[PDB]
Coordinates of C-alpha atoms in Angstrom, one line a residue:
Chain A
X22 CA 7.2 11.0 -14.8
X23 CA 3.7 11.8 -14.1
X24 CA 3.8 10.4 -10.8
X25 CA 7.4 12.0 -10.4
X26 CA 6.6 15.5 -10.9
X27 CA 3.4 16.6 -10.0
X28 CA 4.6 20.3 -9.9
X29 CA 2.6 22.7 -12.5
X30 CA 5.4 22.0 -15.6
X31 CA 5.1 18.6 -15.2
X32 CA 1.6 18.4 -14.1
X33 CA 0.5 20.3 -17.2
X34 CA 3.2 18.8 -19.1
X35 CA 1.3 14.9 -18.6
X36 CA -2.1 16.1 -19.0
X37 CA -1.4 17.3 -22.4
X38 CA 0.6 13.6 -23.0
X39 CA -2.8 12.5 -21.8
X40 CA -4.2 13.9 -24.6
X41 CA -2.6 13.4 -27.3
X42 CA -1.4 9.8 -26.6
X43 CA -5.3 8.8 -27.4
X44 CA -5.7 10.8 -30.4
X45 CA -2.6 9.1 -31.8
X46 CA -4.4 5.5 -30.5
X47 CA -7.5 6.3 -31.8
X48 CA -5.8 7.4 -35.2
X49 CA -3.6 4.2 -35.5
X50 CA -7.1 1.9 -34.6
X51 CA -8.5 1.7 -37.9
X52 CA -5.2 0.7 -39.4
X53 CA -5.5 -2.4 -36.7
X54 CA -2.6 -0.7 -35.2
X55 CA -1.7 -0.4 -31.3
X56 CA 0.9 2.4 -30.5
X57 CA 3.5 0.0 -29.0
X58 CA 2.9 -1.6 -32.5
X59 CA 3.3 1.4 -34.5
X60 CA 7.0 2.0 -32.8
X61 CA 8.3 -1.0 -33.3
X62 CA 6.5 -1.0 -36.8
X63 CA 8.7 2.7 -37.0
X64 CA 11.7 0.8 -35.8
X65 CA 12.4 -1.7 -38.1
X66 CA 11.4 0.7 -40.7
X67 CA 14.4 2.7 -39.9
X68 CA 16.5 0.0 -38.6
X69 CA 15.6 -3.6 -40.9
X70 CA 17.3 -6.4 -39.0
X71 CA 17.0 -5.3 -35.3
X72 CA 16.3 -8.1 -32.8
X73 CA 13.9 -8.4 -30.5
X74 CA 15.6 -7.3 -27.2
X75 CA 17.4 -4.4 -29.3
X76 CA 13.9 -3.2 -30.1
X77 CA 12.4 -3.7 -26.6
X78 CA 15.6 -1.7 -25.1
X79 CA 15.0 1.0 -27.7
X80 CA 11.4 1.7 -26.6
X81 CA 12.2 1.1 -22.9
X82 CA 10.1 -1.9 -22.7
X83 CA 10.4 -5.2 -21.7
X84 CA 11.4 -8.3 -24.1
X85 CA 8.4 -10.3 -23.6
X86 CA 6.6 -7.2 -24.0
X87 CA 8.3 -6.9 -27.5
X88 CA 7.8 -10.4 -28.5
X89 CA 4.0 -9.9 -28.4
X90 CA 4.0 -7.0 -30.2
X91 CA 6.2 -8.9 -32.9
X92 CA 3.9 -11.6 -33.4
X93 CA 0.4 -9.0 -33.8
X94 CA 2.3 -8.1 -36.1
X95 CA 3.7 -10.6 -37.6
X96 CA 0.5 -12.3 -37.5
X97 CA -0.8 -9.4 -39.6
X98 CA 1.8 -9.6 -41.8
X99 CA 3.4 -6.9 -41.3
X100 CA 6.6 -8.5 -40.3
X101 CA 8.2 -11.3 -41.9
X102 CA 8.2 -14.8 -40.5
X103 CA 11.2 -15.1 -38.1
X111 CA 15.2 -12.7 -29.5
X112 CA 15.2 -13.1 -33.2
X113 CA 16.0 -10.5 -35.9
X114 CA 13.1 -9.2 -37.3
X115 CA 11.7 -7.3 -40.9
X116 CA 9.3 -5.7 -42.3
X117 CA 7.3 -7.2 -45.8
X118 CA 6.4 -5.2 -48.0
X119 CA 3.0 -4.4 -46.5
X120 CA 4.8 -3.8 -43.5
X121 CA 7.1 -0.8 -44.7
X122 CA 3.8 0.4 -46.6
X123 CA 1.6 0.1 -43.1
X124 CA 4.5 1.8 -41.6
X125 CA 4.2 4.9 -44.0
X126 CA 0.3 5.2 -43.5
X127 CA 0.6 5.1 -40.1
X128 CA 3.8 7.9 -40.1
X129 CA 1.5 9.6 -42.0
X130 CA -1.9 9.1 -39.8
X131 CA 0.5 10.0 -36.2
X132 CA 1.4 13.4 -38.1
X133 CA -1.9 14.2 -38.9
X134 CA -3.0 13.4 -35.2
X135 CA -0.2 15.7 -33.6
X136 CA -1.9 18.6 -36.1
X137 CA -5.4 17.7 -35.1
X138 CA -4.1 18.3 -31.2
X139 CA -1.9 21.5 -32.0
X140 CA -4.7 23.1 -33.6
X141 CA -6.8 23.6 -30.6
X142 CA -4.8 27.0 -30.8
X143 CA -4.8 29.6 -33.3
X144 CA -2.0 30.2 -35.3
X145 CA -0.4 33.0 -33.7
X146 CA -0.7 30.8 -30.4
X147 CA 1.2 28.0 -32.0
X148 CA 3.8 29.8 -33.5
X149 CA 4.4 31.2 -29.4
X150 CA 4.1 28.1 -28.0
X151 CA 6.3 26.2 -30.2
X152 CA 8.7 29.0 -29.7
X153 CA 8.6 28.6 -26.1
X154 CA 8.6 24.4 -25.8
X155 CA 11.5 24.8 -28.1
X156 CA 13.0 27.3 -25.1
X157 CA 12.2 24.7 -22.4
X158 CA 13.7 21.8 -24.3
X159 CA 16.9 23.6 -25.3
Chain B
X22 CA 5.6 7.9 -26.7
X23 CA 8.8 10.3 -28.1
X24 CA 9.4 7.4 -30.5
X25 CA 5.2 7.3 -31.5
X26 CA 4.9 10.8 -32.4
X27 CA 8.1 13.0 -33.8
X28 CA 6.0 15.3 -35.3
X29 CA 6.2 19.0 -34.1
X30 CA 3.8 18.9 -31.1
X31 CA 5.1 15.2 -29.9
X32 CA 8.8 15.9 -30.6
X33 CA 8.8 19.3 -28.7
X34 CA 7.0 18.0 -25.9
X35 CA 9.5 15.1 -25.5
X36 CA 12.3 17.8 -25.4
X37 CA 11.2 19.6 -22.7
X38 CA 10.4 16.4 -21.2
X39 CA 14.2 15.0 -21.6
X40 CA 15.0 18.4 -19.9
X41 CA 13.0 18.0 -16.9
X42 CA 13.6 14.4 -16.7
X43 CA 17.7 14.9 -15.4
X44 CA 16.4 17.7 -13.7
X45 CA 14.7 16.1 -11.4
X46 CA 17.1 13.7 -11.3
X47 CA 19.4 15.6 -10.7
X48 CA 17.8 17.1 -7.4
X49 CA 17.4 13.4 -6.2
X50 CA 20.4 12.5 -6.4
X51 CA 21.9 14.2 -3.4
X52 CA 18.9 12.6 -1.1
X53 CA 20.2 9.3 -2.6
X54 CA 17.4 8.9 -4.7
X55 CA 16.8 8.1 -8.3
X56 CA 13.6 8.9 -10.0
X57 CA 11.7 5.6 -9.9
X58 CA 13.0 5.2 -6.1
X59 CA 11.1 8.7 -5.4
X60 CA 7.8 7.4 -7.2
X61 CA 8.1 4.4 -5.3
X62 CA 8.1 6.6 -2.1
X63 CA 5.5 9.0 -3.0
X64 CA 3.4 6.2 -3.7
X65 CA 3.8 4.8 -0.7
X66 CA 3.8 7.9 1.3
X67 CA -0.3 8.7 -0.7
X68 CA -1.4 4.4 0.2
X69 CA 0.8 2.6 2.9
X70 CA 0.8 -1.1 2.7
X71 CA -0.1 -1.7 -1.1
X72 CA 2.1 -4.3 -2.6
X73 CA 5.4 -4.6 -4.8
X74 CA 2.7 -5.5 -7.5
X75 CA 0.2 -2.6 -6.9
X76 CA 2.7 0.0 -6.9
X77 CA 4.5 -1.9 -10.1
X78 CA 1.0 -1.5 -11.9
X79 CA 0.2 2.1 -10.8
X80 CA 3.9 3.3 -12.2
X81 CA 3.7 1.0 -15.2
X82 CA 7.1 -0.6 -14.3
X83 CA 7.7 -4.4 -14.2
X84 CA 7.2 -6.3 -10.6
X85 CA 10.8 -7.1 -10.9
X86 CA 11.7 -3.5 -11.1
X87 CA 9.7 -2.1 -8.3
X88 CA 11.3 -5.2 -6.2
X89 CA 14.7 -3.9 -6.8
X90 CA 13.5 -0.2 -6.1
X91 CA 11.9 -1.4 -3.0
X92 CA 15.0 -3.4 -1.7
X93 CA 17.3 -0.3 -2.2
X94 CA 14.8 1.8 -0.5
X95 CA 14.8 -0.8 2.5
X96 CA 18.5 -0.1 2.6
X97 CA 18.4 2.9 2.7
X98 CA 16.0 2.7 6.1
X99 CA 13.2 4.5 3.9
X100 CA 11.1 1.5 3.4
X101 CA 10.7 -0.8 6.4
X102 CA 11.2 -4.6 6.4
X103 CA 9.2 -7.1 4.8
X111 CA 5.2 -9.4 -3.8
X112 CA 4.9 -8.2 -0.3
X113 CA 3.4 -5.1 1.3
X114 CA 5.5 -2.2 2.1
X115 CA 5.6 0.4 4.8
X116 CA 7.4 3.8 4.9
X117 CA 9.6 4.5 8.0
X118 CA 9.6 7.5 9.9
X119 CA 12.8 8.0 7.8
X120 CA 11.0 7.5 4.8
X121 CA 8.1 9.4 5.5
X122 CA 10.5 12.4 6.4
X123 CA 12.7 11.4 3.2
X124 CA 9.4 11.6 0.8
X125 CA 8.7 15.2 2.1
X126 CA 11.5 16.2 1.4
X127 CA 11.9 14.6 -2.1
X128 CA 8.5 16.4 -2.6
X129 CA 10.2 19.5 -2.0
X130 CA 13.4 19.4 -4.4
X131 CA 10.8 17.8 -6.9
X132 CA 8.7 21.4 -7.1
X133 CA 12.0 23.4 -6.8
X134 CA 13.2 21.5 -10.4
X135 CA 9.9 22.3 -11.7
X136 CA 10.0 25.7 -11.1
X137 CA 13.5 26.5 -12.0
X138 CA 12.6 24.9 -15.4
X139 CA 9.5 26.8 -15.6
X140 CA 11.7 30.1 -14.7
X141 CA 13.4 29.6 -18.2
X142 CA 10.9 31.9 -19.2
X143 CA 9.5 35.4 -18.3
X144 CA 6.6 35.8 -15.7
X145 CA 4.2 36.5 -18.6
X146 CA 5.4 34.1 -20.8
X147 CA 5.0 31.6 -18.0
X148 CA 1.8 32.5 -17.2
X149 CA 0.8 32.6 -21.2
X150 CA 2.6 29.4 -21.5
X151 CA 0.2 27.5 -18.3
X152 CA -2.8 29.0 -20.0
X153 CA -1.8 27.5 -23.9
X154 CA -0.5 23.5 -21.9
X155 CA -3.7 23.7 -20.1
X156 CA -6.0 24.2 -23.0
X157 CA -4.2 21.3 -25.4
X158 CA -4.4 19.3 -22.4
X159 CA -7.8 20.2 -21.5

């Protein structure tokens, strides 16, 4: 999309992506978290049971691509020993609340490069755009 | 990224972007090209000769995928015959200028949702979170 539309929206549009996609990795790090870990961790949070390929077509990723990110996790046991169906333990659904939690925090962190007022205005006009 | 972060910043941001997304789109289509088609194009248009691989890598798609886009842009006479290396056509070469083109009109009439000030405010606010 970056590459598609290099146009000032879009342009401006990635680079703040660019931004805040880091500050959301370097939030989930200390939790030994990944982003493409912390969906799927999200995922089967909302959705216990999902397989593997339902997951990877979910978040637009490949299978195999999936599969990996199912066994970090299972290997930090975070998901429960098993495209297969897959849940979260119970230090899965709690990691997966931390981490909701540490993502949120990261999003503020990012919005509050602007002053109030100036968020207020330019949620008001993303919400126009996206409408 | 939409499915990382649904707080207000990431969840707004993925709006506009799921506006702009068919928008573009949509202004491909009648050139007979989808989205990933025209990335395909662009890049090739910005680095003749790099491979089905390179240009896989540098739009985060699988080699598979960009094989596929690559064999419907060969049909299309865009992309000239043969992971290889690939070639625009004069065709192509035309085709991606003009793709450019429709591209930066979708962007604008996006960006034209809002008032002239509010645009400009609006540039000033994406470029500083993204900054």
């Amino acid at each position: 999309m970056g590459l598609a539309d290099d146009a000032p929206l879009g342009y401006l549009l990635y680079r703040v992506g660019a931004v805040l996609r880091p500050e959301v990795s370097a939030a989930l790090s200390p939790l030994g978290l990944t982003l493409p870990e912390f969906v799927c961790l999200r995922m089967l949070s909302q959705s216990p049971g999902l397989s593997s390929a339902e997951l990877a077509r979910h978040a637009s990723v490949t299978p195999q691509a999936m599969n990996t990110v199912l066994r970090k996790l299972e290997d930090a046991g975070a998901v429960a020993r098993p495209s297969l169906p897959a849940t979260l333990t119970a230090r899965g659904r709690a990691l997966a609340k931390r981490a909701e939690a540490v993502v949120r925090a990261a999003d503020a962190r990012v919005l509050a490069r602007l002053t109030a007022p100036q968020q207020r205005e330019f949620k008001r006009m993303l919400e126009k755009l996206g409408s």
